[PDB]
Design a protein around this nucleic acid. Structure first.
Ligand SMILES: [Mn+2]
Ligand SMILES: [Mn+2]
Ligand SMILES: [Mn+2]
Ligand SMILES: [Mn+2]
Ligand SMILES: [Mn+2]
Ligand SMILES: [Mn+2]
Lengths: 483, 483
DNA sequence: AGAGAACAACAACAAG
DNA sequence: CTTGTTGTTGTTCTCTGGTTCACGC
DNA sequence: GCGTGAA
DNA sequence: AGAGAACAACAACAAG
DNA sequence: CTTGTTGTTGTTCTCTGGTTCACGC
DNA sequence: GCGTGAA
């Protein structure tokens, strides 16, 4: 219990052997603080206590190749250890998933990422189920579903009908999940609204393109070292990319005109109306709050799609003081919010918002279909749970919640609020927490590809498909089922 | 002494805690076998022997930030520990160096790499002295020499006149070392001969460009996964790059015509004369033997520039059976070997070859200037060594070697041959081993940039200039002065 | 978001 | 009072959102 | 059969 | 070269 | 005789050779 | 002052 501190003469020698490990093997300084590094060092001081200080270390230490098969061993092992805890959440309707496609930068295999999301004990599960390569077959809808089912067979899940899937609107991905529950990713929808609305407001082409050519010049002339914050290029495939460039120019506006004046290249910025650049940054600033919100899988997120849409309608509210080109942008944004974003929502987005206890809003058109939807889903929950055996009814329990009153406090945690209410609401708070675990976007699959890319590197390029599948899952397992 | 082996019940648990470290912290499997990792694990079993198994590990383990200053501490420390062993080799004329310029792919600083090379105990030293950034100043000759002197001041070397420098023919780098000994890198020279000779033989444009467009199609059509060895693009900035592409096509020729026929794109290869592709690969095959030779710093290399030039003259010897376009290539290659490569050699290249004991060759035009050169260099060695005090003369000892007879055996190691001859030849074998430690090219600086790039990565991009300088040197130190 | 890294800028502490 | 060594705070820089399927006229 | 939409 | 990685293909060995 | 676990051999894939100075007419 | 050579 009472852990002993070593002598300072023995502790300075420990920061000397650690520094020499990072230097010789070319590891990052932060390696000395990994959760698995510490847990491993604790084991090796045990071996010194039992066997003494004269142990054959090379014989004790494993080889990298036997490490490579152990994580493939353990991957098979842990997929069975939870092959039961997983199959329960799918049965009980309370499981959702996100899938998407990615291709790696070296070998160029196309990949199918699958994540899983369900509620446990006041906390959310965020599992990487698998990253299976398509083996260079065409990314047709049939092959995708073929590789989707194959990932779920790893845990003895063969149904897939009770799992709510969240994807982008890729024509081939969309068709794969035509036979089950598919929710449109709201980060791609919000991105479509921005892309189209700027296509449709070409009055703003000249200021944006003018800014784009300043970034292009600072990179070609190797001048970003003079900025305390560098200027960012506009990459269309990145969300809110125009805002990132514009802000990088504003937040460095003073030092940019000076550097430009210095190089006699002052004509590249004098025709740029700074005021409109500032107006677009204030407008798109709230879009970044919504984007970072929609990408949350550690807390409920689907319930905020509808109120975020209202906040977009509020930002682009017509204003008598807008200039002509900004007035037109706000006009096109509220349009595409209607025909691009609202057009591709579902009762899952409204019902998730219903279960946000500040429930005063959609009292109008929606509580009809929401009650019709909520009652049906509490019905299948009983149907399933009665097979688990081998006054205050749901339509009442529905309206009993519909009269609760709670204030928007900054500490309010709706997910905690339903655990602390599972008593009075037994069967509805189960439907609610089934709804509140669905991600509002496919960002969990995006992050899986980022993690994948951290493994398939320049020097680790020979790593195999199943070795990445194994490392990603185990790393996700040791996060969701360890401390 | 007799190191104990642990129980198998305690050894399986060690490959389980190692596998979990690699998984959780996302480290490569090969991390379990680093020289510094093993030396570190040996220390941690000692702490378990002394203090027992209940040690506070988090308090014992250092932070990454205190690791970052320790390697900067140790870097200052070890540059003083050898600030003496280094300054001796420079004094005794037996030190050479290679310098070049590089810029990193993220922050884009220009860098000056400096390596050091001298003889010790039958083995060669290959030191990374420093990678100092120019801080975005212009890479003028004055700033380079300014940063060169600054790297040598780190070890209290202020002379630099006794150090033989080996660089490429960059106009600015060349001018920096106008005041000291500069030897032309022979890898850049050989590369100039190839580049020019192919510019001057445009009859071969159509086969090469035809091959280039097959690689371009296999990459665009994502077809390299069908090849057991992939096709390589021609990058002009890589040495023998045309040979690498051509061979990648030949070694996969059968499977390439089949894949092309399959895609109905068979017209991209039918006009390609395979025989001339094969002739160019056989010719350039020996160039790759010379290139990989010239890049050696663990064994003597400057002494092989002259006999490699002969082997190039021999490969491109006129042959009555050559076709017209190959006959012209060999004609232009032997030309540029004369006006590009031989044009930029020095008596260091001839004298280094002289000290290869199979010394029958240059008996003609060169032993005059070589004797004149060797006698002067043995003279400054005595001048220096007499200040170290606070029959069989050199001109005889020169000719005594000039009558030795030795056979080219495959095990022959000339560097070992001069240690085992320092007795009969005391003062000449010192000049010889001073000559035999000079690198034939600047590849040591190239490799320093490769190592640098292994540190300045995508996620380690915030690492500082002096932190890379420190890590590179210490890693080089622990290789040249440890076991 | 939610991952991996590094470090400038301070704040606490010790030795002197 | 100084320096000289450690520890924590908070900013900056990375990456995934991608490159061809499905459909309708 | 070919242009269009969304990645 | 001379660095960093991974793994297919076998070879040795053990358990059964 | 089978499998099932470990260890070694040898191949394949990375990167640096680079992006602007110096000079002469 | 501008094209050329070598990175
Ligand atoms: Mn997609
Ligand atoms: Mn990508
Ligand atoms: Mn160079
Ligand atoms: Mn580069
Ligand atoms: Mn995606
Ligand atoms: Mn170079």
């Amino acid at each position: 219990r009472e852990l002993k501190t070593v002598s300072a003469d023995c502790k300075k020698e420990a920061i000397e052997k650690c520094a020499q490990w990072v230097v010789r093997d070319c590891r990052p300084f932060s390696a000395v603080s990994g959760s698995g590094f510490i847990d491993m060092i604790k084991f090796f001081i045990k071996v010194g206590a039992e066997y003494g200080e004269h142990v054959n270390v090379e014989e004790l230490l494993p080889s990298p190749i036997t490490l490579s098969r152990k994580v493939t061993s353990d991957a098979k092992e842990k997929k069975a250890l939870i092959s039961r805890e997983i199959k329960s959440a799918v049965e009980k309707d309370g499981a959702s998933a996100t899938i998407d496609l990615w291709t790696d930068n070296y070998i160029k295999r196309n990949f199918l990422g699958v994540t899983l999301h369900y509620h446990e004990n006041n906390e959310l599960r965020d599992l990487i189920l698998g990253l299976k390569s398509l083996d260079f077959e065409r990314s047709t809808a049939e092959n995708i579903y073929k590789k989707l089912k194959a990932i779920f067979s790893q845990f003895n899940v063969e149904d897939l009908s009770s799992i709510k899937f969240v994807t982008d609107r890729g024509a081939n991905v969309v068709k794969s999940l035509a036979n089950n529950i598919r929710i449109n990713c709201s980060s791609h929808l919000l991105s479509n609204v921005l892309e189209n609305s700027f296509e449709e407001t070409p009055e703003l082409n000249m200021p944006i393109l003018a800014c784009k050519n300043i970034v292009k010049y600072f990179k070609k002339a190797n001048l970003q070292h003079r900025l305390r914050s560098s200027l960012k290029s506009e990459c269309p495939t990145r969300w809110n990319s125009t805002y990132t460039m514009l802000r990088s120019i504003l937040d460095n506006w003073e030092s940019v005109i000076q550097i430009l004046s210095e190089a006699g290249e002052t004509q590249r910025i004098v025709h740029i109306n700074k005021s409109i650049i500032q107006t677009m940054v204030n407008i798109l600033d709230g879009f970044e709050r919504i984007f970072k919100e929609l990408q949350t899988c550690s807390s409920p997120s689907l319930c905020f799609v509808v109120p975020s849409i209202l906040k977009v309608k509020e930002i682009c509210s017509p204003d008598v003081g807008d200039v002509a080109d900004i007035a037109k942008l706000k006009v096109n944004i509220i349009k595409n919010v209607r025909i691009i974003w609202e057009e591709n929502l579902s009762i899952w987005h409204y019902t998730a918002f219903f279960f946000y206890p500040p429930a005063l809003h959609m009292q109008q058109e929606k509580v009809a279909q929401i009650k019709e939807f909520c009652l049906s889903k509490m019905e299948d929950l009983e149907l399933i749970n009665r097979m688990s055996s081998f006054p205050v009814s749901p339509s009442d329990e529905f309206e009993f919640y519909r009269k609760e009153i709670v204030i928007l406090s900054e500490d309010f945690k709706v997910m905690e609020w339903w655990n602390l209410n599972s008593k009075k609401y037994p069967k509805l708070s189960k439907l609610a927490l089934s709804l509140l675990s669905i991600p509002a976007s496919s960002a969990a699959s995006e992050r899986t590809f980022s993690l994948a890319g951290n493994i398939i590197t320049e020097k680790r390029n020979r790593i195999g498909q199943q070795t990445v599948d194994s490392l990603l899952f185990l790393n996700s397992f040791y996060k969701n089922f360890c401390k």
